[PDB]
Amino acid sequence: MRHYEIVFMVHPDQSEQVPGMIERYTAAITGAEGKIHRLEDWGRRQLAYPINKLHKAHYVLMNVEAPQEVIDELETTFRFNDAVIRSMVMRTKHAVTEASPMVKAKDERRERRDDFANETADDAEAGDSEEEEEE
Amino acid sequence: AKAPIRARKRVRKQVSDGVAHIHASFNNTIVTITDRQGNALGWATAGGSGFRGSRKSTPFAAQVAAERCADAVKEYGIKNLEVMVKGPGPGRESTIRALNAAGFRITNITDVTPIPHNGCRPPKKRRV
Amino acid sequence: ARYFRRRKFCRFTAEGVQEIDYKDIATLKNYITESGKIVPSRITGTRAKYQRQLARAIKRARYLSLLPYTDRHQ
Amino acid sequence: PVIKVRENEPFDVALRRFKRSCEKAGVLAEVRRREFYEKPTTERKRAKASAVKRHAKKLARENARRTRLY
Amino acid sequence: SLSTEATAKIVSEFGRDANDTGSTEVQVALLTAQINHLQGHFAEHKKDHHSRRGLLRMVSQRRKLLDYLKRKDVARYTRLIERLGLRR
Amino acid sequence: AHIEKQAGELQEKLIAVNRVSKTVKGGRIFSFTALTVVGDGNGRVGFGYGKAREVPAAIQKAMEKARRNMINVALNNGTLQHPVKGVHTGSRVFMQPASEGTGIIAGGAMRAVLEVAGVHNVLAKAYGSTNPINVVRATIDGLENMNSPEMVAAKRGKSVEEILGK
Amino acid sequence: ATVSMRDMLKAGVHFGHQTRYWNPKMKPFIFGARNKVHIINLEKTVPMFNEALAELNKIASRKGKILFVGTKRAASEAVKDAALSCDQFFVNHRWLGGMLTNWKTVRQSIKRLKDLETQSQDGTFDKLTKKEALMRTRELEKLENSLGGIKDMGGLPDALFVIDADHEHIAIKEANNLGIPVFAIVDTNSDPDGVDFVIPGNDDAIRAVTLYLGAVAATVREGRSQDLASQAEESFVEAE
RNA sequence: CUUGAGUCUCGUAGAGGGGGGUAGAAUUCCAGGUGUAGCGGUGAAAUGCGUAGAGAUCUGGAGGAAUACCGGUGGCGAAGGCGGCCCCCUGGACGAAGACUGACGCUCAGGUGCGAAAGCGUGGGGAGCAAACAGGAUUAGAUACCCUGGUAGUCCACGCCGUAAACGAUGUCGACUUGGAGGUUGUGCCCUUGAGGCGUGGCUUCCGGAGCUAACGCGUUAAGUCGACCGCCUGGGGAGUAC
RNA sequence: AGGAUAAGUGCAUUAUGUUUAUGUGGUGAUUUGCCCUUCUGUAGCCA
């Protein structure tokens, strides 16, 4: 129907849950006559302050179009998930279906802000493997 | 409002360095030295020789507080210093100058002043 | 000279782009002090459009800890 | 308020009188104000009111030259 | 809110079937769809008085257009008013 | 030192008298203030408030100010050709057309102000503030709403005012 | 005639004068703001001055006793400079009131003034306290500099030439009270109403104050060729 | 008919309404570690808290109101009214082109509908502050002034008669009357050159002209020029009470 | 590694600029309140 730009972040120690869930979420969206207009994972970062303990988190920009009843239920699920810690959703008017240039800011994350471990393989399993899937 | 300057008297750490925490208000200063592992090697305050009224928060009562606490942590065998600052209150500068004049380094003057979100109601029984 | 819009540094004390989206971090800092925190619009004469939309867009980012929230995170 | 970074023409004491502007700017710049939801527009938020006196001070610098007091 | 597929259905069922949304019958039936939409909100809670001002706008105007309409032709009026239901 | 206007006739209408006080700063001095009206016989906007040490020097000051920055104005016959309601600063006064068979009808200093103004037969009731200082504006505002005769036919009456500049 | 508006396509500016909102009633004859301040141009004054340049022709036909009054920080020399001619009198120090309305007292004080001036300049002003005499001399000089306009002139002038509005409020204030027609130079912080003749312009410098009010123009110089059959037969030398 | 008003898709601003979601930090507390005497309050002050180890500080848990600075003279709601940030459901306004209807208009006795706040029934909840009540300080006292403990209250939601400074202070709504600029916003145009300028609308505010006031003040949002139609006043006190 | 527009080095107690007791009612300065004009006129009032 209309586009509601979900961006969300992931706890390190829990990261192994997300590669399975996102693909199930893409199947919930497209199974409701919406589209995924992006799904870019940004990598692992240092947070500006702790959120639910630990100083680092992992970033995913999902960018939904979907019927309005369902997008309210995915954002609530993602903020209350057992691996995603927080999410923020912004409005359809005077805004994009695909966001601003974060293209550099993604690489910077992968290059230098990364731990290089299993938890950061999962980030790449969660955005740079698909943009839409049926589960 | 001063800790033990004399030797063997209380438990020592002798780690060459510490961090100080300064709580600056318009009515007091609390200057408290701690270990880099996070344990108090001494404190003082600005009513440590009896300043009261406005005079309790001013640069000169802020300075003597800093001079009482800085003295003691030389028997806990510290030589170097770092500072955390918390409030736009007075003597916030006179206190830094006092730590450095006490024979310590003060290169990192880290503002970490907390933010209340104004969850309380302040005392009023009047027109203003 | 016609349809050379944003060819150059024009408007602002410092030229970031967008004000409502917050997904990039490196073009919002243009309007953020060192304490980790929003520029005070009275003192600066901020460009009002960009400032009004940055008031929601910085909070959304803050709550997603993309930026500091409070001075103790300096 | 002392700020982590240093002022221009710098010395080993950091101070807020040179490179601060948004710190305690409504958090403790308040005096006995209670919890309010519309009273600040006329009590607290005097920006139009306070801008005039500053404008008057920039106005008087021209006007002293124009009378030739200098 | 009011959307393209409700609005098209209304033009299809009410007034002329193309290129008209402005006439008395269909104008009343477009207002009806927003009153229904407002009653959709008013099936979550009932301390909705700041919106109720608006409900009474959309009714008051139906009273204005039903008045005009019944002074033009009693057919469009008696059909419309029964075909858009409302009240017991 | 200014041009003055004159009338070939004397008016010395003293309307008010007052005294100036500072009460501690140099204490209180003997000075008076005064208001005096200078007409023409057909009217003037002439009103003068002045001040000096004593009452005579004070009135003569005030009589001078009643004839500088002022000009005379004129009206034919002892009536006014418009029923209008003159207002000046809360002192509001009324007029309606009348006969010559009535002259003045008024009291105090007002009967003396209206005689020079030419609006004494038309004299109808005053309302709002009617103490001396402002009641006396008859010959000022009541001659700025003025109408005065110049036609030979009532149906040429609006046509005749148009061609006076066209 | 046309030369006076051949020079207004050549100067007319000040690039603003005061405030963001300026004086609204002069807005038609003048250019609006640019980049967070106020700017003015010479361009918006020429359509106004395409007929209105005929009023410099009406103050040159009856020319004998003209007074250039209202001095400012950069306008003072321009009040001296447009009035440099020998029928035309000027001040160089700020004007104050009563110099036209209590003219009685002023003419009694001129009559004192030229006597104590011949005395001071001959050296005849001496006292056994030198301080009391030199201090009277400094203050006598200020009178000479302030009054120099009406001082050497036969009586109240036939026009009054106000160059400034912005601080010299009084010179316009008294001209309305003596009824003497006004010849005005208005700026973008002053209205063109309430004065009888205008140059649209600015109040400072030689941009409007002698660029039409001098020998370079043709309209202050064709008024004066109409004096030569009315009160005189030859007088065109005197005036600029 | 359009010269009034109404309506569709398109776009845009905002704390409107109803219901969901969510983080960090001061006061406060507990615990353990480290650590010793004032801490607090204010005009200055004492009462208060504290050696049963207070104040402060490191680590980790507790909890509820609350959410800066951005935030402005902004904007929204019917007026009072709305303030952390976000979404769902939905209102009402702001712009623009295509398109339609075509006086469907104006006001409003009666009328029904409808709350900032506390008052107030029940449910939720309590860290701080507080009428009362105590005690201090002040003094002719001291209920005012000022502080300290401390409770209902504050704090949430609906609900009962909706109180007020419940306001474009200015009824309702509209037509007409030199502008410029601020705040901040649709959108055409710019070196997009800094909350800007010009083009054309927007609410919203400074400044001042024609006209108006008793003065402040108003001035294109009128307190101007007026329009229709409704409300209300006839000296004060005593009375927004009585009846 | 975006706590890096680095203060836009545009910054200054940052929006209540506050608090340590009071002392009754009226009262000074005038009996010519008068020294500007023809006709249409004036201050007790006139050409």
PDB file of N, CA and C in Angstrom, chain B residues 5 7 13 18 20 24 30 67 70 77 83-85 91 97 112 119 122:
ATOM      1  N   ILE B   5      46.942  10.646  55.694  1.00  0.00           N
ATOM      2  CA  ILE B   5      48.194  11.177  55.109  1.00  0.00           C
ATOM      3  C   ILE B   5      49.498  10.484  55.560  1.00  0.00           C
ATOM      4  N   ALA B   7      51.322   6.957  56.944  1.00  0.00           N
ATOM      5  CA  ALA B   7      51.610   5.711  56.406  1.00  0.00           C
ATOM      6  C   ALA B   7      51.222   4.528  57.308  1.00  0.00           C
ATOM      7  N   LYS B  13      47.047   1.102  47.899  1.00  0.00           N
ATOM      8  CA  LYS B  13      46.926   0.570  46.574  1.00  0.00           C
ATOM      9  C   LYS B  13      48.197   0.925  45.799  1.00  0.00           C
ATOM     10  N   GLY B  18      45.149   7.791  39.288  1.00  0.00           N
ATOM     11  CA  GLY B  18      43.755   7.800  39.635  1.00  0.00           C
ATOM     12  C   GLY B  18      42.946   8.782  38.728  1.00  0.00           C
ATOM     13  N   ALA B  20      39.444  11.618  39.490  1.00  0.00           N
ATOM     14  CA  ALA B  20      38.746  12.455  40.490  1.00  0.00           C
ATOM     15  C   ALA B  20      37.382  12.778  39.814  1.00  0.00           C
ATOM     16  N   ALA B  24      29.874  19.825  40.962  1.00  0.00           N
ATOM     17  CA  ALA B  24      29.841  21.291  41.185  1.00  0.00           C
ATOM     18  C   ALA B  24      28.410  21.847  41.238  1.00  0.00           C
ATOM     19  N   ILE B  30      31.688  18.734  45.975  1.00  0.00           N
ATOM     20  CA  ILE B  30      32.173  17.439  46.493  1.00  0.00           C
ATOM     21  C   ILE B  30      33.273  17.041  45.479  1.00  0.00           C
ATOM     22  N   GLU B  67      42.390  20.885  47.528  1.00  0.00           N
ATOM     23  CA  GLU B  67      43.645  20.896  48.304  1.00  0.00           C
ATOM     24  C   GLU B  67      43.610  19.927  49.494  1.00  0.00           C
ATOM     25  N   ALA B  70      43.452  16.186  47.528  1.00  0.00           N
ATOM     26  CA  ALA B  70      44.635  15.945  46.759  1.00  0.00           C
ATOM     27  C   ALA B  70      45.804  15.516  47.660  1.00  0.00           C
ATOM     28  N   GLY B  77      49.999   6.642  47.446  1.00  0.00           N
ATOM     29  CA  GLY B  77      51.139   6.619  46.485  1.00  0.00           C
ATOM     30  C   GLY B  77      50.833   6.932  44.983  1.00  0.00           C
ATOM     31  N   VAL B  83      40.257  13.991  35.521  1.00  0.00           N
ATOM     32  CA  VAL B  83      39.051  14.586  36.186  1.00  0.00           C
ATOM     33  C   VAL B  83      37.759  14.456  35.378  1.00  0.00           C
ATOM     34  N   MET B  84      36.656  14.136  36.119  1.00  0.00           N
ATOM     35  CA  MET B  84      35.296  14.145  35.623  1.00  0.00           C
ATOM     36  C   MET B  84      34.585  15.317  36.238  1.00  0.00           C
ATOM     37  N   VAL B  85      33.897  16.087  35.415  1.00  0.00           N
ATOM     38  CA  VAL B  85      33.172  17.313  35.802  1.00  0.00           C
ATOM     39  C   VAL B  85      31.650  17.148  35.484  1.00  0.00           C
ATOM     40  N   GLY B  91      33.410  27.784  40.941  1.00  0.00           N
ATOM     41  CA  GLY B  91      34.631  27.099  41.349  1.00  0.00           C
ATOM     42  C   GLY B  91      34.950  25.853  40.538  1.00  0.00           C
ATOM     43  N   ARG B  97      42.661  23.982  38.527  1.00  0.00           N
ATOM     44  CA  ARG B  97      43.927  24.719  38.819  1.00  0.00           C
ATOM     45  C   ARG B  97      44.505  24.197  40.182  1.00  0.00           C
ATOM     46  N   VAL B 112      31.272  15.044  31.609  1.00  0.00           N
ATOM     47  CA  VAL B 112      30.251  13.982  31.706  1.00  0.00           C
ATOM     48  C   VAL B 112      29.019  14.453  32.580  1.00  0.00           C
ATOM     49  N   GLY B 119      11.866  15.162  35.929  1.00  0.00           N
ATOM     50  CA  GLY B 119      10.794  14.252  36.486  1.00  0.00           C
ATOM     51  C   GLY B 119      10.231  14.691  37.821  1.00  0.00           C
ATOM     52  N   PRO B 122      10.075  21.021  41.843  1.00  0.00           N
ATOM     53  CA  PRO B 122      10.954  21.643  42.870  1.00  0.00           C
ATOM     54  C   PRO B 122      10.150  22.351  43.939  1.00  0.00           C
TER      55      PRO B 122
END
